[PDB]
Paper text:
Aromatic residues cluster in the core of folded proteins, where they stabilize the structure through multiple interactions. NMR studies in the 1970s demonstrated that aromatic side chains can undergo ring flips—that is, 180° rotations of the χ2 dihedral angle (Cβ–Cγ axis)—even when engaged in stabilizing interactions in the hydrophobic core. Here we capture ring flipping events of a buried tyrosine residue in the SH3 domain of the JNK-interacting protein 1 (JIP1). Our data therefore suggest that the conformation of the aromatic ring at position 526 is determined by steric interactions dictated by the size of the surrounding amino acids.
Accordingly, we designed four different mutants of JIP1-SH3 (H493A, V517A, V517L and A541L) and obtained their high-resolution structures by X-ray crystallography. Of note, three mutants (H493A, V517A and A541L) induce a staggered conformation of Y526, with χ2 dihedral angles ranging from −41° to −75°, whereas V517L shows an eclipsed conformation of Y526 and an almost identical structure to the wild-type protein. The H493A and V517A variants show almost identical crystal structures and for a subset of residues, the chemical shifts of which are unaffected by the mutations, the resonances of the two variants fall on a straight line together with the resonances of the wild-type protein. This suggests that they are in fast–intermediate exchange between two conformations represented by the crystal structures of the wild-type protein and of the H493A/V517A variants. In agreement with this, both variants show line broadening and chemical exchange contributions as detected by 15N and 1HN relaxation dispersion. Analysis of these data shows that the structural features of the minor state of the wild-type protein are captured by the H493A/V517A crystal structures, as shown by the excellent agreement between the ΔδCPMG values for the wild-type protein and the two variants. In addition, the analysis yields exchange rates between the staggered (canonical β-strand) and the eclipsed (classic β-bulge) conformation of kEX = 2,830 ± 70 s−1 (H493A) and kEX = 6,800 ± 300 s−1 (V517A), compared to kEX = 2,600 ± 70 s−1 determined for the wild-type protein. Finally, the observable chemical shifts of the two variants, in conjunction with analysis of the relaxation dispersion data (Supplementary Discussion), show that the H493A mutation slightly stabilizes the minor state relatively to the major state, whereas the V517A mutation almost inverts the relative populations of the major and minor states.
Author numbering:
A (entry chain AAA): 491 to 548
B (entry chain BBB): 487 to 548
């Protein structure tokens, strides 16, 4: 699934992904807690973030 | 200065990390914005829990 960061996200935890507004992401929703596992296509970084910081694109 | 403020959870937040604060929608919170990453240090006034959450998941009410 592809998505776009709708808000800036600065990690507090090492497993997290830094997001800038409008970063294109490849994304798997983790249904147990509504975090995304993500790849930031701008930065090449991989990590998790809380799902409400991005929206799915089609 | 980012002074303490009253807030409400606008989204459900389930921790992945031990230092995090569980939110339910419309939880009243006492909140101090941490400027280095825009996480809130927070007290959940419903649950009595202490912890951090990302700022987008609540709205200031003061
Ligand atoms: O006497 C302790 C400090 O009290 C104030 O700080 C608290 O209250 C503030 C106003 O609501 C908050 O912004 C802050 O988060 C609290 O620590 C005061 O501002 C400080 O100068 C005092 O040292």
């Amino acid at each position: 699934q592809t998505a776009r960061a709708i808000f800036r996200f600065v990690p507090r935890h090492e497993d997290e992904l830094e997001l800038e507004v409008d970063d294109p992401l490849l994304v798997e929703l983790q249904a147990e807690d509504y975090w995304y596992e993500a790849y930031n296509m701008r930065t090449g970084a991989r990590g998790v973030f809380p799902a409400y910081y991005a929206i799915e694109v089609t």
